[PDB]
Amino acid sequence: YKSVALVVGVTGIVGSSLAEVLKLPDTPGGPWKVYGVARRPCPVWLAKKPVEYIQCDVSNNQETISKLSPLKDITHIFYVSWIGCQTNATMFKNILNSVIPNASNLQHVCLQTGIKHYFGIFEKVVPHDSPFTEDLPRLNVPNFYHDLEDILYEETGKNNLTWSVHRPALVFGFSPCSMMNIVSTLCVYATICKHENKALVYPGSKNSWNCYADAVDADLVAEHEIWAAVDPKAKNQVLNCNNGDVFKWKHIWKKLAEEFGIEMVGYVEGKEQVSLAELMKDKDQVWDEIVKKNNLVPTKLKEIAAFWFADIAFCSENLISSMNKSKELGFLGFRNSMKSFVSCIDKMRDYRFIPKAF
Amino acid sequence: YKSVALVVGVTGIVGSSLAEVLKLPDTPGGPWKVYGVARRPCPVWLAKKPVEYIQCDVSNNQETISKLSPLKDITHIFYVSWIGCQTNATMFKNILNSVIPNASNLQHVCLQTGIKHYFGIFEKVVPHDSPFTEDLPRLNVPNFYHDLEDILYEETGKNNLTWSVHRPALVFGFSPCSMMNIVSTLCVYATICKHENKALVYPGSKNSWNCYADAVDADLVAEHEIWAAVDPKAKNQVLNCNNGDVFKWKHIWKKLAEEFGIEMVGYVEGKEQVSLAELMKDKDQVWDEIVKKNNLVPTKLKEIAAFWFADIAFCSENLISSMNKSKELGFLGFRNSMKSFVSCIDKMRDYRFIPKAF
C-alpha cells in the first residue's frame, strides 16, 4: 500500500463513496488501504468490501483513543461525518488528538463541511450573495463550519500537515445506511404516491420550482477530496464541490414522476407551499406495508426519509456555488446532475430499498 | 500547412478570435493556413497577422464566386458572421455553393448560430424552459437559425462532409472592428458617466439585476469550434458553448464601477427599467470630445456601442444553457466569466478604444 486513508463517517453518503473510489484501479495515491470509522456495527454491504471497519463513537474521547491510536500507518484523514455545536467540534478534535501523535507518516487532513449548513436556515448581518466563491470572507455570524476550520488550521499548522476544506453542495447519492438523503426522501414519497394511486404532487414553493439549483454526486465529492489529498497544487485550499451544472426542481420532478410511472402535479399558480413532513406524518404503517408487499429491505420511514429536509429544499433559492477555483487549479471533474439523480434512483432499486420500476 | 480554414466573418468578435487561435503553437489540426473573409477593407490590426484577407460581400453571389471559387485548398469552413431572414440564408448558401465544387479536400462545415437570437425577443407556442440542452426539439415557430441548420445538413449530406452547429451564449469579447458587443457597450456607458462625473447608474430591470446569467468568451468559442472541427467524436453534433459558470449582472456592475473608479448605483427597489438607448441618445458629440480628450482610436458612438442590445440583456432572465453534452464528449474548456469580462475591459484599454484606468 502507498497511501492509508482514515475515512471518518464511512457509512455516510460521501464516506461510502470514498471507500469505493479509494479502491478503484488507477486511483491517484493508490494503492490505498482504507480504514472506515462509523458508530454502527459494520453493515453487510461494507463487510464484503476491502475496508478495515472500525466501530467507534467518535464523540467518546476514550473510545476514539482506544480504537484509533493503534493505527500507526495512517497517511490521510478524511473527515466526512454528517454535521447535524460543541459536539461536532469535539468529534473532530477527538479524531485529530487520537491520530496526530500516533501516525508518524501522517500527511494531510481533509475536512468536509458544506456550501451551506441546512441551506442557510440558521444564518442581522447581510449575507454574501451567490454564486458562492471560496474567497468570500467570514461574516461575524456564528457558524459550526467555521469552528471546525479553525481546529483544522490550528492542528495542521502546528504539526506540519497539509489541509483541505471541501464545501459540497446538496449531495445526490445513495448507500444502504445514510439518512438525511434528498434522493431517498423523494423516492420514498414517489413510492407512497404510487402505492396509494395518487399523483406525484409537488408540495413546494413557486420559487424553488422555477429557480436554478445545484447539487453534487457523492462519487464526485470523493474524487474531489482524493484529488486535493494527492495534488500538491491543490493543498491548503478551501474548495467548493458541485456537479458543474445547474438544474431546476421542476425538471427533477417530471423525471421523478416518469421514473415511477405516475402522473405529476407541478406547482399550481396561487397554491402556497405545504409541508411534505405534514403530508407524510401518519404514513409509517403505509411504509411497512409497502416494504412487505414489495419485499424491500426493511426500513422504517423515519430512517429512510427526512421530509423536513425536502421541505427546506423546496423553500430555498439563490444558493448556486462556483467551481471556478477548482477548475482553475486543474480539477475538471463534473456530473450531469439529471443523470446523477436518475442513477441514485436506479441504485436504490438495485439494492431493493424501493420497488422496481415495473 | 495541414489544415486550411475559411473564416467567414473574420472581423467579427468570434471570427477575430478564430484567426488568432488557429495560429497558436500546438493548435489541434495545425499548422493552419487561414483565409479571413469580411465585407470591409482589411483592418490594420489584421493586416499584420498571418491571415490571408479576402474582402467580399458574401450577400453578393457573383462576388462570392469570384473571390472564393479560386481557393482550392480549403479543408474547413467556419461560418461565424454576425446574424442580424432570406439574406442570412442567401449568404451561407453563397459560401457553400462557391467552395464545395472547388475545394476537393474540403472536410467540414462549422455553422455558428446562438442559444437565442437576440435573447429570444422574436420567439403562441410554449417555449422550451431552461437550462437549454441541444436535444430539445424544434417547436413550430419560425427561426432564422433553423433555416441555416437545414442548409448545412442538406449540403454537407449530399457532399459527404461533416458538420457542426455551435450555439454560443452571449459573447464577451473585443477586437478593433466588431459592434453589437455587450462589453464595449457597457465600457462606453461607464466612460461617459466617468467623463460627466456621474455615477454608474444601473438602468435595468430588477429581475436581470438579481437572476443568474451566462455568457461565453470569444476565445472559448474559437477553441470549441476548432475542437469540433478536428475531433472525430465531436462531429455531426449540435453543441452549446458557454463559459461553464454563471454570474449576475449585479456583480458585473460592481466590477465595472470598480474598474472605472466611479461610484455605482445599483437597482433601486421600486424604480422601473429605463432605456439606456434613451439615456444615451444625445451623447454622440460627448463621445467625440471623450475620444479627443483621451486620444482614443476615433470611433462614432453608433459604431462602438449598441445600447438597445444592453437594454434587451437587462430585461432578460431564465436563459442559462447547459455544457453537459460538450463535457460528456470530452470538451472541458471553460472560462471564469468575471475574469473574462475584466479581460475584455483590459483589451479595450490596451488597444486605446477607451481611456486608461488611471
XYZ file of C-alpha atoms in Angstrom:
716
model
C 0.000 0.000 0.000
C 1.147 3.503 -0.907
C -1.411 5.502 0.994
C -3.534 4.820 4.046
C -6.859 6.602 4.408
C -8.842 7.047 7.619
C -12.406 7.679 6.417
C -14.370 9.122 9.341
C -18.032 8.591 8.548
C -17.651 5.581 6.236
C -21.395 4.705 6.334
C -22.452 8.169 5.318
C -23.258 9.130 1.772
C -19.845 10.600 0.951
C -17.911 8.226 3.204
C -19.335 5.200 1.364
C -18.344 6.729 -1.995
C -14.773 7.333 -0.639
C -14.428 3.678 0.416
C -15.307 2.586 -3.122
C -13.447 5.229 -5.088
C -10.281 4.868 -2.946
C -10.157 1.215 -4.063
C -10.562 1.667 -7.836
C -7.712 0.744 -10.205
C -5.511 3.745 -11.021
C -6.833 5.947 -8.217
C -4.401 8.735 -7.577
C -2.374 8.000 -4.439
C -3.014 4.270 -4.733
C -2.928 1.514 -3.892
C -4.902 2.718 -0.913
C -5.507 0.933 2.355
C -8.804 2.045 3.822
C -9.860 2.285 7.476
C -13.609 3.182 7.750
C -14.947 4.573 11.037
C -18.614 4.738 11.980
C -20.814 4.430 15.125
C -22.923 1.437 13.975
C -21.763 -2.195 13.639
C -20.328 -2.916 10.140
C -23.191 -3.049 7.556
C -23.360 -6.207 5.369
C -22.754 -4.191 2.184
C -19.447 -2.905 3.603
C -18.301 -6.174 5.258
C -17.750 -7.653 1.745
C -15.529 -4.705 0.704
C -11.731 -4.422 1.293
C -12.243 -1.827 4.035
C -10.963 -2.215 7.582
C -14.040 -1.312 9.599
C -13.653 0.382 12.969
C -16.805 0.661 15.073
C -16.340 3.816 17.170
C -18.443 6.612 18.678
C -16.051 9.469 17.902
C -17.942 11.734 20.316
C -16.443 9.482 23.104
C -12.808 10.572 23.661
C -11.627 7.388 25.367
C -13.099 5.118 22.735
C -11.604 7.218 19.926
C -8.207 6.974 21.604
C -8.649 3.231 22.193
C -9.640 2.454 18.598
C -7.672 4.971 16.517
C -4.405 5.410 18.435
C -3.143 1.942 17.397
C -3.474 2.844 13.669
C 0.129 3.887 13.156
C 0.189 3.771 9.337
C -2.431 6.438 8.525
C -1.262 8.929 5.839
C -4.528 10.792 5.082
C -7.556 11.634 7.230
C -10.907 12.213 5.508
C -13.333 13.746 7.975
C -16.685 13.318 6.233
C -19.150 12.604 9.061
C -22.600 14.234 8.630
C -22.797 17.537 10.577
C -26.156 17.961 12.371
C -22.162 22.882 18.135
C -19.670 21.665 20.823
C -20.345 18.046 19.778
C -19.110 18.454 16.162
C -16.019 20.343 17.292
C -15.363 17.678 19.978
C -15.711 14.799 17.490
C -13.202 16.304 15.053
C -10.792 17.281 17.913
C -11.075 13.680 19.151
C -10.048 12.316 15.798
C -7.036 14.656 15.469
C -5.874 14.197 19.083
C -6.050 10.392 18.712
C -4.209 10.127 15.305
C -1.698 13.013 15.062
C 0.574 11.789 17.934
C 0.470 8.153 16.694
C 0.600 8.241 12.890
C 4.191 9.254 12.114
C 3.719 9.293 8.304
C 0.506 11.376 8.520
C 0.434 13.845 5.612
C -2.946 15.503 5.139
C -6.269 16.265 6.794
C -9.318 16.610 4.594
C -12.273 18.364 6.354
C -15.727 18.205 4.685
C -18.221 20.951 5.592
C -20.729 22.259 3.000
C -21.693 25.364 0.995
C -24.445 25.949 3.490
C -25.405 24.280 6.712
C -29.051 23.086 6.124
C -29.491 25.551 3.203
C -28.610 28.513 5.494
C -31.711 28.268 7.677
C -29.645 29.239 10.799
C -27.754 32.211 9.218
C -28.900 40.538 11.225
C -25.634 40.921 9.208
C -26.237 40.914 5.421
C -25.223 37.501 3.960
C -22.986 37.062 0.926
C -24.920 36.811 -2.354
C -24.438 33.873 -4.746
C -22.706 32.439 -6.865
C -20.760 31.443 -3.791
C -16.947 31.604 -4.078
C -14.346 30.421 -1.616
C -12.603 33.850 -1.268
C -15.738 35.489 0.328
C -14.683 36.488 3.871
C -16.235 35.184 7.086
C -19.040 37.426 8.312
C -19.473 37.954 12.078
C -22.267 35.375 12.368
C -21.620 32.133 14.360
C -21.067 29.070 12.162
C -20.307 25.452 13.138
C -18.344 25.026 9.910
C -16.033 27.933 10.758
C -15.276 26.367 14.206
C -14.156 23.092 12.524
C -11.980 25.029 10.004
C -10.271 26.771 12.924
C -9.386 23.433 14.564
C -8.123 22.090 11.212
C -5.887 25.116 10.630
C -4.515 25.104 14.173
C -3.775 21.399 14.353
C -2.371 21.030 10.812
C -0.207 24.188 11.261
C 1.435 23.023 14.499
C 2.188 19.563 13.100
C 3.425 20.359 9.596
C 0.459 18.725 7.804
C -1.448 19.902 4.779
C -5.207 20.629 4.954
C -8.232 20.819 2.650
C -11.702 22.222 3.298
C -14.297 20.802 0.903
C -17.677 22.538 0.688
C -20.102 20.160 -1.101
C -23.394 21.441 -2.460
C -26.605 19.411 -1.764
C -25.491 15.784 -2.161
C -27.117 13.297 -4.558
C -26.165 9.795 -3.569
C -27.238 6.554 -2.046
C -25.818 3.752 0.070
C -27.576 1.193 2.309
C -27.116 3.231 5.612
C -27.283 7.040 5.225
C -30.333 9.223 6.090
C -30.807 12.997 5.556
C -30.612 11.985 1.904
C -32.676 14.055 -0.602
C -32.980 11.499 -3.366
C -34.101 8.743 -0.947
C -36.660 11.080 0.604
C -38.141 11.952 -2.767
C -38.132 8.290 -3.977
C -39.977 7.291 -0.784
C -42.619 9.991 -1.379
C -42.952 8.856 -5.009
C -43.285 5.246 -3.830
C -46.109 6.155 -1.376
C -47.940 8.166 -4.020
C -47.666 5.241 -6.409
C -48.808 2.744 -3.747
C -51.836 4.917 -2.931
C -52.723 5.571 -6.625
C -52.188 9.292 -6.265
C -50.264 11.702 -8.420
C -46.793 12.931 -7.557
C -47.967 16.264 -6.152
C -45.322 18.931 -5.740
C -45.740 20.417 -2.264
C -43.077 23.158 -2.561
C -42.801 26.866 -3.206
C -43.162 28.601 -6.547
C -39.659 29.968 -6.319
C -37.978 26.607 -5.608
C -39.962 25.056 -8.543
C -38.607 27.577 -11.087
C -35.194 28.750 -9.713
C -31.811 27.368 -10.709
C -30.383 24.906 -8.202
C -27.272 22.841 -7.962
C -26.001 19.730 -6.303
C -23.141 17.191 -6.187
C -22.885 13.471 -6.789
C -21.386 11.685 -3.774
C -18.820 9.968 -6.038
C -17.692 13.361 -7.402
C -17.198 14.619 -3.845
C -14.950 11.528 -3.228
C -12.959 12.220 -6.438
C -12.536 15.884 -5.438
C -11.381 15.032 -1.901
C -8.906 12.441 -3.224
C -7.582 14.972 -5.813
C -6.952 17.606 -3.106
C -5.389 14.890 -0.921
C -2.784 13.979 -3.571
C -2.278 17.003 -5.865
C 0.339 19.275 -4.284
C -1.012 22.246 -6.223
C -4.441 21.761 -4.640
C -3.328 21.553 -0.979
C -4.093 24.119 1.766
C -7.193 25.370 -0.095
C -10.861 25.831 0.727
C -12.664 24.319 -2.258
C -16.347 24.137 -3.298
C -17.666 20.966 -4.816
C -20.644 20.726 -7.126
C -21.519 18.830 -10.328
C -20.569 21.768 -12.554
C -24.084 22.436 -13.908
C -27.447 23.684 -12.774
C -30.907 22.187 -12.766
C -34.428 23.077 -11.660
C -36.659 21.161 -9.285
C -39.453 21.355 -11.843
C -37.338 19.170 -14.225
C -36.227 16.756 -11.480
C -39.917 16.434 -10.545
C -41.014 15.465 -14.076
C -38.155 12.971 -14.209
C -39.143 11.553 -10.859
C -42.757 11.091 -11.993
C -41.569 9.464 -15.241
C -39.272 7.012 -13.416
C -42.137 5.854 -11.204
C -44.691 5.768 -13.998
C -47.088 8.128 -12.221
C -48.856 11.355 -13.057
C -47.183 14.641 -11.994
C -48.899 17.643 -10.478
C -46.433 20.523 -10.618
C -46.566 23.883 -8.938
C -50.096 25.320 -9.200
C -50.208 29.141 -9.519
C -51.523 30.655 -6.283
C -51.249 27.430 -4.197
C -48.907 28.019 -1.219
C -46.187 25.614 -0.063
C -47.464 22.712 2.162
C -45.244 20.609 4.407
C -44.226 17.247 2.953
C -43.427 16.274 6.572
C -47.096 17.066 7.350
C -48.349 15.097 4.322
C -46.335 12.076 5.477
C -46.801 12.229 9.283
C -49.221 9.269 9.508
C -47.517 7.105 6.782
C -45.234 4.949 8.975
C -47.614 1.920 8.711
C -48.152 2.517 5.000
C -44.384 2.306 4.552
C -44.332 -1.023 6.487
C -46.971 -2.439 4.113
C -45.015 -1.218 1.020
C -41.843 -2.908 2.308
C -43.802 -6.150 2.827
C -45.765 -6.011 -0.421
C -42.629 -5.317 -2.492
C -40.115 -7.381 -0.462
C -37.964 -4.383 0.134
C -35.082 -4.153 2.563
C -36.860 -3.497 5.875
C -36.550 0.198 6.709
C -38.574 2.457 8.973
C -39.995 5.587 7.303
C -38.190 7.827 9.832
C -34.841 6.120 8.918
C -35.039 6.238 5.092
C -36.729 9.658 4.540
C -36.264 13.163 6.011
C -39.316 15.018 4.639
C -38.422 18.155 6.666
C -35.155 18.297 4.682
C -37.018 18.239 1.360
C -39.288 20.993 2.758
C -36.270 23.274 3.337
C -35.008 22.469 -0.185
C -38.416 23.473 -1.541
C -38.384 26.935 0.089
C -34.768 27.667 -0.855
C -33.324 29.600 -3.776
C -30.277 31.645 -4.799
C -27.768 29.051 -3.467
C -25.663 28.341 -6.563
C -21.958 27.769 -5.872
C -18.947 28.264 -8.194
C -16.426 25.635 -9.340
C -14.109 28.179 -10.954
C -11.419 27.861 -8.226
C -11.213 24.062 -8.551
C -11.229 24.232 -12.367
C -8.551 26.908 -12.416
C -6.466 24.547 -10.192
C -6.898 21.777 -12.800
C -9.844 19.755 -11.371
C -12.197 19.204 -14.320
C -14.428 16.527 -12.781
C -18.191 17.015 -13.329
C -21.509 15.179 -13.476
C -24.718 15.721 -15.425
C -26.992 16.409 -12.443
C -30.121 14.969 -14.117
C -28.215 11.746 -14.905
C -26.839 11.697 -11.372
C -30.317 11.942 -9.851
C -31.583 9.089 -12.025
C -28.545 6.963 -11.198
C -29.369 7.292 -7.480
C -32.951 6.073 -8.200
C -31.516 3.140 -10.146
C -29.123 2.347 -7.267
C -31.911 2.377 -4.661
C -33.842 -0.050 -6.845
C -30.808 -2.300 -7.487
C -30.274 -2.547 -3.675
C -34.002 -3.237 -3.139
C -34.764 -0.178 -0.960
C -37.580 0.947 -3.254
C -39.749 -1.094 -5.588
C -38.730 -1.866 -9.132
C -39.997 0.308 -11.954
C -42.041 -2.460 -13.471
C 0.126 23.506 -43.782
C -2.019 20.631 -42.540
C -5.367 22.347 -42.464
C -6.845 25.295 -44.310
C -9.579 27.324 -42.644
C -12.024 29.663 -44.372
C -13.181 32.001 -41.589
C -16.325 33.771 -42.803
C -16.725 36.857 -40.650
C -13.062 37.324 -39.692
C -13.597 40.891 -38.357
C -16.381 39.844 -36.055
C -15.871 39.068 -32.410
C -15.619 35.294 -32.816
C -14.007 35.437 -36.256
C -11.130 37.549 -34.902
C -10.590 35.057 -32.056
C -10.531 32.169 -34.628
C -7.838 33.913 -36.700
C -5.641 34.177 -33.603
C -6.366 30.820 -32.017
C -5.983 28.948 -35.348
C -2.398 30.268 -35.472
C -1.232 29.338 -31.955
C 1.520 26.736 -31.461
C 0.098 23.246 -30.906
C -3.417 24.086 -32.091
C -5.234 20.911 -32.937
C -5.352 20.446 -36.714
C -2.318 22.669 -37.221
C -0.365 24.142 -38.745
C -3.336 26.050 -40.069
C -3.496 28.316 -43.080
C -6.152 30.948 -42.554
C -8.319 32.736 -45.128
C -10.413 35.514 -43.446
C -13.471 36.888 -45.261
C -15.224 40.133 -44.390
C -17.082 42.993 -46.176
C -14.763 45.853 -45.096
C -11.204 46.518 -46.340
C -8.580 44.686 -44.200
C -8.256 46.416 -40.766
C -4.706 47.446 -39.711
C -4.775 45.093 -36.706
C -5.399 42.119 -39.023
C -3.032 43.178 -41.855
C -0.058 42.440 -39.521
C -1.329 38.895 -38.798
C -0.588 35.757 -40.907
C -4.138 35.717 -42.289
C -4.972 35.824 -45.986
C -7.625 38.525 -46.084
C -10.409 38.340 -48.652
C -12.605 41.424 -48.965
C -16.018 40.124 -50.075
C -19.707 40.970 -49.644
C -20.965 37.401 -49.248
C -24.545 38.577 -49.829
C -23.414 39.175 -53.499
C -23.384 35.779 -55.282
C -21.100 36.784 -58.148
C -18.517 38.356 -55.888
C -18.534 35.326 -53.574
C -17.967 33.075 -56.580
C -15.249 35.387 -57.931
C -13.328 35.579 -54.647
C -13.862 32.160 -53.047
C -14.013 29.761 -56.007
C -10.247 30.065 -56.653
C -9.451 28.872 -53.081
C -8.918 25.227 -53.952
C -7.105 24.166 -50.761
C -9.825 24.857 -48.161
C -10.329 21.947 -45.697
C -12.613 23.576 -43.082
C -15.258 26.302 -43.330
C -16.071 28.342 -40.215
C -19.237 30.327 -40.809
C -19.201 32.841 -37.957
C -20.666 36.027 -39.469
C -22.960 38.011 -37.114
C -26.645 37.149 -37.761
C -28.893 40.251 -37.678
C -34.255 36.191 -42.984
C -33.619 35.441 -46.719
C -30.356 37.432 -46.541
C -28.688 35.198 -43.897
C -29.757 32.037 -45.704
C -28.512 33.506 -49.027
C -25.118 34.469 -47.558
C -24.473 30.980 -46.178
C -25.771 29.304 -49.410
C -23.409 31.597 -51.344
C -20.446 30.451 -49.326
C -21.270 26.734 -49.731
C -22.112 26.993 -53.452
C -18.830 28.844 -54.121
C -16.495 26.482 -52.112
C -17.975 22.947 -52.214
C -17.488 22.436 -56.010
C -13.938 23.904 -55.924
C -12.279 22.691 -52.719
C -11.607 18.997 -53.370
C -10.101 18.307 -49.907
C -12.984 20.059 -48.081
C -13.776 18.134 -44.884
C -16.053 20.033 -42.517
C -18.508 22.907 -42.237
C -18.815 24.672 -38.914
C -22.025 26.796 -38.609
C -22.278 29.287 -35.699
C -25.786 30.316 -34.597
C -26.545 31.063 -30.911
C -28.560 29.833 -27.908
C -31.054 32.548 -28.646
C -31.407 35.042 -31.429
C -31.340 38.487 -29.643
C -32.242 36.866 -26.272
C -35.443 35.364 -27.786
C -37.221 38.677 -28.335
C -38.744 37.365 -31.640
C -39.904 33.933 -30.303
C -48.117 31.493 -29.177
C -46.475 28.023 -28.803
C -44.983 27.471 -25.313
C -41.157 27.839 -25.474
C -38.713 25.333 -24.007
C -37.677 26.150 -20.425
C -34.006 26.476 -19.425
C -31.303 25.120 -18.791
C -31.202 24.828 -22.550
C -29.964 21.490 -23.955
C -29.221 20.570 -27.536
C -31.668 17.583 -27.648
C -34.768 19.866 -27.157
C -36.831 19.501 -30.362
C -37.678 22.314 -32.773
C -41.008 23.932 -31.945
C -43.263 25.094 -34.812
C -42.152 28.732 -34.538
C -40.121 30.289 -37.427
C -36.408 30.669 -36.657
C -33.574 32.026 -38.836
C -31.145 29.689 -37.079
C -33.192 26.617 -38.015
C -33.169 27.692 -41.724
C -29.324 27.844 -41.704
C -29.111 24.404 -39.984
C -31.304 22.967 -42.743
C -28.958 24.272 -45.465
C -25.937 22.920 -43.547
C -27.473 19.454 -43.200
C -28.588 19.305 -46.829
C -25.335 20.498 -48.345
C -22.996 18.513 -46.057
C -25.124 15.332 -46.519
C -25.054 15.420 -50.330
C -21.301 16.045 -50.440
C -20.004 13.656 -47.784
C -18.814 16.406 -45.397
C -19.075 16.593 -41.646
C -20.986 19.433 -39.924
C -21.108 21.223 -36.565
C -23.700 23.632 -35.184
C -22.299 25.803 -32.389
C -24.755 27.738 -30.220
C -22.768 30.392 -28.284
C -24.308 32.151 -25.307
C -23.971 35.988 -25.041
C -20.405 36.671 -26.211
C -17.796 38.540 -24.144
C -15.003 39.686 -26.387
C -13.324 42.547 -28.112
C -11.463 43.285 -31.326
C -10.896 46.593 -33.167
C -13.914 46.163 -35.614
C -16.975 44.385 -34.145
C -20.176 46.134 -32.917
C -23.243 44.587 -31.198
C -20.713 43.885 -28.458
C -22.001 43.924 -24.830
C -18.739 44.619 -23.056
C -17.880 47.540 -25.387
C -21.354 48.999 -24.918
C -21.069 48.878 -21.147
C -17.472 50.272 -21.144
C -18.659 53.178 -23.322
C -21.510 53.933 -20.888
C -19.060 53.736 -17.967
C -16.680 56.060 -19.831
C -19.450 58.669 -20.412
C -20.552 58.503 -16.786
C -16.960 58.996 -15.692
C -16.432 61.879 -18.148
C -19.596 63.601 -16.891
C -18.791 62.998 -13.170
C -21.881 60.885 -12.674
C -22.306 57.533 -11.020
C -22.582 54.293 -12.953
C -26.370 54.082 -12.697
C -27.915 50.723 -13.478
C -30.836 51.336 -15.836
C -32.121 47.729 -16.000
C -34.838 45.557 -14.537
C -34.919 44.100 -11.048
C -35.018 40.592 -12.416
C -31.981 40.985 -14.707
C -30.031 42.557 -11.761
C -30.562 39.518 -9.492
C -31.037 36.497 -11.850
C -28.337 34.052 -12.891
C -26.930 34.731 -16.348
C -24.299 33.184 -18.510
C -22.024 34.065 -21.356
C -19.024 32.917 -23.435
C -15.569 34.303 -24.075
C -14.928 34.743 -27.807
C -11.652 32.786 -27.499
C -13.510 29.851 -25.891
C -15.978 29.835 -28.786
C -12.939 29.600 -31.174
C -11.441 26.714 -29.132
C -14.804 24.899 -29.148
C -15.286 25.328 -32.909
C -11.730 24.125 -33.606
C -12.259 21.094 -31.283
C -15.454 20.074 -33.131
C -13.647 20.670 -36.445
C -10.860 18.190 -35.600
C -12.199 15.689 -33.028
C -13.943 12.868 -34.901
C -16.001 12.041 -31.820
C -17.419 15.576 -31.780
C -18.508 15.768 -35.449
C -22.118 15.954 -36.729
C -23.347 17.426 -33.419
C -25.295 20.497 -32.360
C -23.295 21.886 -29.441
C -23.885 24.755 -26.971
C -20.995 26.938 -25.978
C -20.741 28.892 -22.756
C -18.023 29.628 -20.172
C -19.175 26.818 -17.877
C -20.279 29.055 -14.977
C -22.921 31.585 -14.100
C -22.806 35.185 -12.989
C -25.189 38.009 -12.118
C -25.373 41.445 -13.684
C -25.311 42.969 -10.212
C -21.739 41.577 -9.733
C -20.582 42.564 -13.238
C -21.933 46.057 -12.485
C -19.914 46.446 -9.262
C -16.841 45.209 -11.116
C -17.469 47.643 -13.925
C -17.759 50.561 -11.484
C -14.572 49.435 -9.701
C -12.586 49.194 -12.960
C -13.538 52.753 -13.894
C -13.058 54.144 -10.405
C -16.599 55.519 -10.194
C -19.497 55.227 -7.795
C -22.166 52.567 -8.526
C -25.904 52.996 -8.215
C -27.439 49.530 -8.387
C -31.032 48.515 -8.819
C -33.268 50.704 -6.627
C -36.351 48.892 -5.238
C -39.481 50.174 -6.986
C -37.627 52.061 -9.784
C -38.676 50.659 -13.195
C -36.295 49.855 -16.059
C -35.278 52.921 -18.197
C -33.796 52.695 -21.681
C -30.014 53.037 -21.835
C -30.548 53.844 -25.543
C -32.752 56.746 -24.354
C -30.173 57.881 -21.770
C -27.508 57.958 -24.492
C -29.478 59.338 -27.482
C -27.898 62.827 -27.425
C -24.326 61.671 -26.466
C -22.755 61.404 -29.950
C -20.888 64.755 -29.514
C -19.914 63.883 -25.949
C -18.308 60.715 -27.300
C -16.373 62.793 -29.900
C -14.999 65.005 -27.103
C -14.006 61.929 -24.997
C -12.132 60.445 -27.975
C -10.297 63.765 -28.453
C -9.611 64.430 -24.777
C -8.247 60.904 -24.213
C -6.605 60.355 -27.633
C -8.669 57.302 -28.259
C -8.999 55.467 -31.542
C -11.598 57.564 -33.389
C -14.950 55.783 -33.204
C -18.501 57.030 -33.602
C -20.835 56.262 -30.674
C -23.238 54.399 -33.004
C -20.315 52.160 -34.190
C -18.778 51.200 -30.812
C -21.938 50.831 -28.636
C -25.365 49.188 -29.115
C -27.299 50.470 -26.073
C -30.525 48.800 -27.320
C -28.696 45.452 -27.042
C -27.780 46.107 -23.403
C -31.440 47.082 -22.815
C -32.615 43.642 -24.011
C -29.967 41.988 -21.798
C -31.315 43.976 -18.850
C -34.918 42.759 -19.285
C -33.928 39.130 -19.883
C -33.773 36.191 -17.498
C -34.029 32.391 -17.409
C -31.637 31.902 -20.382
C -28.983 29.619 -18.880
C -27.603 26.992 -21.273
C -26.003 23.596 -20.494
C -22.477 22.421 -21.373
C -23.126 18.828 -20.318
C -23.194 17.498 -23.923
C -19.813 19.040 -24.800
C -18.265 17.906 -21.497
C -19.602 14.386 -21.897
C -17.939 14.390 -25.376
C -14.611 15.338 -23.737
C -14.520 19.156 -24.210
C -13.519 20.557 -20.809
C -12.697 24.120 -21.876
C -14.089 26.875 -19.602
C -13.575 30.476 -18.517
C -14.209 32.351 -15.281
C -16.850 34.754 -16.616
C -15.926 37.582 -14.204
C -12.265 37.303 -15.281
C -13.344 37.165 -18.913
C -15.359 40.376 -18.594
C -12.427 42.180 -16.978
C -10.028 40.886 -19.626
C -12.223 42.456 -22.333
C -12.056 45.823 -20.470
C -8.276 45.475 -20.270
C -8.112 44.660 -24.005
C -10.204 47.700 -24.977
C -7.839 49.854 -22.938
C -4.687 48.212 -24.368
C -5.999 48.950 -27.919
C -6.879 52.537 -26.912
C -10.648 52.329 -27.574
C -11.486 53.503 -24.057
C -9.455 55.630 -21.677
C -6.904 54.156 -19.327
C -7.878 53.392 -15.755
C -5.562 55.990 -14.330
